[PDB]
Scaffold this active site. Structure first.
Site, PDB file in Angstrom:
ATOM      1  N   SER A 194      32.490 -13.934  23.985  1.00 30.09           N
ATOM      2  CA  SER A 194      32.225 -14.178  22.552  1.00 30.09           C
ATOM      3  C   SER A 194      32.720 -12.970  21.744  1.00 30.09           C
ATOM      4  O   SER A 194      33.899 -12.613  21.851  1.00 30.09           O
ATOM      5  CB  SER A 194      30.776 -14.586  22.351  1.00 30.09           C
ATOM      6  OG  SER A 194      30.449 -15.670  23.184  1.00 30.09           O
ATOM      7  N   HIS A 250      30.219 -22.962  24.859  1.00 31.22           N
ATOM      8  CA  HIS A 250      30.262 -21.573  24.394  1.00 31.22           C
ATOM      9  C   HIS A 250      30.007 -20.608  25.549  1.00 31.22           C
ATOM     10  O   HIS A 250      28.944 -20.665  26.174  1.00 31.22           O
ATOM     11  CB  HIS A 250      29.222 -21.346  23.294  1.00 31.22           C
ATOM     12  CG  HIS A 250      29.345 -20.019  22.617  1.00 31.22           C
ATOM     13  ND1 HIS A 250      28.276 -19.166  22.440  1.00 31.22           N
ATOM     14  CD2 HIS A 250      30.418 -19.393  22.080  1.00 31.22           C
ATOM     15  CE1 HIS A 250      28.685 -18.074  21.815  1.00 31.22           C
ATOM     16  NE2 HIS A 250      29.983 -18.187  21.588  1.00 31.22           N
ATOM     17  N   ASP A 299      35.430 -24.719  20.894  1.00 30.83           N
ATOM     18  CA  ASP A 299      34.390 -23.704  21.033  1.00 30.83           C
ATOM     19  C   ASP A 299      33.320 -23.865  19.945  1.00 30.83           C
ATOM     20  O   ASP A 299      33.636 -24.041  18.763  1.00 30.83           O
ATOM     21  CB  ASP A 299      35.027 -22.319  20.949  1.00 30.83           C
ATOM     22  CG  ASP A 299      34.031 -21.211  21.135  1.00 30.83           C
ATOM     23  OD1 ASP A 299      33.775 -20.829  22.297  1.00 30.83           O
ATOM     24  OD2 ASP A 299      33.504 -20.720  20.115  1.00 30.83           O
TER      25      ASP A 299
HETATM   26  O1  LIG Z   1      29.490 -13.569  19.460  1.00 33.08           O
HETATM   27  C1  LIG Z   1      29.203 -14.799  19.511  1.00 33.08           C
HETATM   28  O2  LIG Z   1      28.191 -15.195  20.159  1.00 33.08           O
HETATM   29  C2  LIG Z   1      30.123 -15.824  18.849  1.00 33.08           C
HETATM   30  C3  LIG Z   1      30.401 -15.522  17.385  1.00 33.08           C
HETATM   31  S1  LIG Z   1      31.732 -14.304  17.201  1.00 33.08           S
HETATM   32  C4  LIG Z   1      33.008 -15.044  16.130  1.00 33.08           C
HETATM   33  N1  LIG Z   1      32.853 -16.301  15.748  1.00 33.08           N
HETATM   34  C5  LIG Z   1      33.742 -16.904  14.973  1.00 33.08           C
HETATM   35  N2  LIG Z   1      34.828 -16.274  14.552  1.00 33.08           N
HETATM   36  C6  LIG Z   1      35.065 -14.998  14.896  1.00 33.08           C
HETATM   37  C7  LIG Z   1      36.230 -14.358  14.433  1.00 33.08           C
HETATM   38  C8  LIG Z   1      36.476 -13.043  14.801  1.00 33.08           C
HETATM   39  C9  LIG Z   1      35.565 -12.368  15.611  1.00 33.08           C
HETATM   40  C10 LIG Z   1      34.414 -13.002  16.064  1.00 33.08           C
HETATM   41  C11 LIG Z   1      34.159 -14.337  15.700  1.00 33.08           C
END
Ligand SMILES: O=C(O)CCSc1ncnc2ccccc12
Ligand SMILES: *[C@@H]1O[C@H](CO)[C@@H](O)[C@H](O)[C@H]1NC(C)=O
Length: 344
Positions: free
Chosen positions: A145, A290, A246
């Protein structure tokens, strides 16, 4: 179990000024080292960081961390759970900087919080060199993530750090899980990661890889947080794991089925597949889900009949195409769960 070590340099801190740290299980005789970066979103101003401190405090502080953790999935030491790297030295690095592992700013009178993610990684590596990492053959920097994006932002800096310290024989590689995002249009407008990362970079004193920084230049470093833009600038080998649908991507896209949404979802999967066409080491199943790599049942999903632990083993062999041992595995079917092995 992996045992907690708080950093000996106590100036390298979590958000609230408590020391950062790492959990370690050594494997004597193995010269392989796995360093895993935890994920968990981010925060980008005083008010949203204050809310995160109230109800997500373990992601901002080490004060309440437990003495041990159990290694699971790719961090498990049992071959039945981890066919890939069960005998490696295992390191779990908690995410307590809220900065996608990019920050280099200390807490002070001008700063309520410290954002030190990039320095935390460097200090963990430094302190491990005296605990056996100096004898390593491979250092695999992995993460899930926000931690997967952290791999893309930091793998080449770890490689440069080890070279400058006099360890040119350690081969540094990256494994980015669920950290390959698209700066696309939302399904309904509602903030967006591009704007939040623009603000975050200023708030965190965030840093990006040098070649990518030189392409995009001042004010545009946010581009380097997007895998399809930063990956072609990297020198270390990087294996990319990404669900085509995702859940965190869909969340930021404001998706929670009629024709408009059907077309939107099909187009998202096609765009993601396009960005991976020229990524030779990749695993991208057509599932709505995820993360994967530290889940106990990570062994179950397959693409074209090949599991992720097998694909990673084939990648190791390729870095010594291989008969019956593929490394580029991207689903072509266009809807979530068209792959029967998707997580239930
Ligand atoms: O960490 C997590 O559990 C998921 C969320 S992280 C994330 N989600 C969506 N778009 C991004 C774009 C750049 C960097 C990080 C993100
Ligand atoms: C401790 O960490 C800080 C921040 O990375 C660094 O500036 C300093 O030189 C380090 N000191 C020691 C003794 O490691």
């Amino acid at each position: 179990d992996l045992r907690l070590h708080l950093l000996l340099n106590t100036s390298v801190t979590c958000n609230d000024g408590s020391p950062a740290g790492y959990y370690l299980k050594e494997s004597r005789g193995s010269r392989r080292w796995l360093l895993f970066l935890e994920g968990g979103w981010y925060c980008f101003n005083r008010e949203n960081c204050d809310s995160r401190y109230d109800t997500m405090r373990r992601l901002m502080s080490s004060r309440d961390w437990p003495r041990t953790r159990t290694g699971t999935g790719i961090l498990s030491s049992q071959p039945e759970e981890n066919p890939y790297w069960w005998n490696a030295n295992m390191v779990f690095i908690p995410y307590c900087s809220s900065d996608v592992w990019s920050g280099a700013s200390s807490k002070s009178e001008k700063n309520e919080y410290a954002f030190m993610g990039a320095l935390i990684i460097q200090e963990v590596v430094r302190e491990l060199l005296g605990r056996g990492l100096s004898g390593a053959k491979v250092l695999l920097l992995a993460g899930s993530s926000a931690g997967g994006t952290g791999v893309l932002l930091n793998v080449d800096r770890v490689a440069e750090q080890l070279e400058k310290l006099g360890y040119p024989a350690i081969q540094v590689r990256g494994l980015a899980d669920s950290g390959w995002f698209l700066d696309n249009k939302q399904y309904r407008h509602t903030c967006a990661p591009t704007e939040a990362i623009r603000r975050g970079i200023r708030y965190w004193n965030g840093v990006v890889p040098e070649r990518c920084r030189r392409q995009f230049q001042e004010g545009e470093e946010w581009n380097c947080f997007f895998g399809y833009k930063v990956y072609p600038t990297l020198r270390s080998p990087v294996f990319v794991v990404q669900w085509l649908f995702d859940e965190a991507q869909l969340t930021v896209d404001n998706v929670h089925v009629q024709e408009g949404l059907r077309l939107y979802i099909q187009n998202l999967g096609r765009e993601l597949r396009h960005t991976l066409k020229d990524v030779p080491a990749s695993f991208a199943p057509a599932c709505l889900s995820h993360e994967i790599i530290i889940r106990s049942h990570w062994t179950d999903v397959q693409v074209k009949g090949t599991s992720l632990p097998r694909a990673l083993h084939c990648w190791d062999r390729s870095l010594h195409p291989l008969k019956g041992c593929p490394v580029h595995l991207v689903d072509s079917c266009p809807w979530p769960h068209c792959n029967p092995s998707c997580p239930t």
